[PDB]
Design a protein around this nucleic acid. Structure first.
Ligand SMILES: [Mg+2]
Ligand SMILES: [Mg+2]
Ligand SMILES: [Mg+2]
Ligand SMILES: [Mg+2]
Length: 195
RNA sequence: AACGGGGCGCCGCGGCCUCUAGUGUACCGGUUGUCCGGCAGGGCACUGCCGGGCAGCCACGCCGUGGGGGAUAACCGCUGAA
């Protein structure tokens, strides 16, 4: 369905400064400064109009179809996430699961390593991005903290995908006669705010 | 069973001749029948035949022959509205 005018307003929280800048004919750059840090996002080639109105960020479209109109609600979700990112932070929690070979997980500098995954002599090594803090709690839990939800969630997804083999290395999920198979790995259990 | 680690091949490609092998009517030796009077030396038997064999060529011999980056496919995920 066609749309003539649509509008979405996002409420800026206390202590959070937003700078919406135009870097092209339809290109934006949004910098969000908070107590927890500074977030910078790009919105390139967008029909959505971004503007600041007295403590609010204004999103509007004009002559918009369904494809363009749904980008108002998407950008409200993104902008809210960046506000919470610099006011409360994000914490993604992972649980380590194994059956016979315990998975020695350690954080060495900016590298994350996992040992003995299924007894493999090989090592899993993941570079930790800047602005992402990785900690190993106990032997069984991992927490990723940061102010960017996309960057924290992306790294937490790459840890889980590390312990998921593909091709002919993939073990059977179910055991003999329908039982639980060899399911060992690191799984994202959920997310939370640092504060 | 697997990942990861170490070692080597086969097929192909590109070179090389130190070794080994082949050839080597350059060369050296042995020997048959006959002719040059005999010895010596030699012609011919289409290198007469047999053995060895430098160089050159050559393989049946030796040498080299890799990992990475990007955008991607099938697809797997993050965030994420309509
Ligand atoms: Mg000969
Ligand atoms: Mg004589
Ligand atoms: Mg004569
Ligand atoms: Mg002759």
């Amino acid at each position: 369905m066609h749309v003539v005018y649509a509008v979405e307003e996002v409420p800026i929280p206390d202590g959070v400064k937003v700078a919406i800048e135009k870097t092209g004919p339809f290109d934006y750059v949004v910098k969000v400064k908070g107590p927890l840090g500074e977030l910078v996002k790009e919105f390139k080639n967008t029909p959505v109009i971004m503007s600041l109105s007295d403590g609010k960020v204004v999103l509007e479209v004009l002559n918009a179809k369904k494809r363009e109109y749904a980008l108002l609600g998407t950008y409200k979700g993104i902008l809210k996430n960046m506000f919470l990112g610099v006011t409360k932070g994000w914490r993604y929690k992972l649980k380590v699961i194994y059956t016979h070979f315990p998975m020695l997980v350690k954080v060495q500098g900016n590298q994350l390593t996992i040992e003995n995954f299924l007894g493999r002599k090989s090592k899993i090594v993941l570079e930790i991005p800047k602005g992402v803090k990785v900690e190993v709690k106990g032997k069984e839990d991992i927490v990723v903290e940061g102010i960017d939800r996309e960057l924290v969630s992306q790294f937490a997804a790459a840890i889980q995908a590390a312990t998921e083999l593909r091709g002919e290395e993939k073990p059977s999920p179910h055991g003999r006669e329908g039982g639980l198979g060899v399911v060992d790995g690191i799984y994202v259990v959920g997310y939370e705010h640092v504060k």
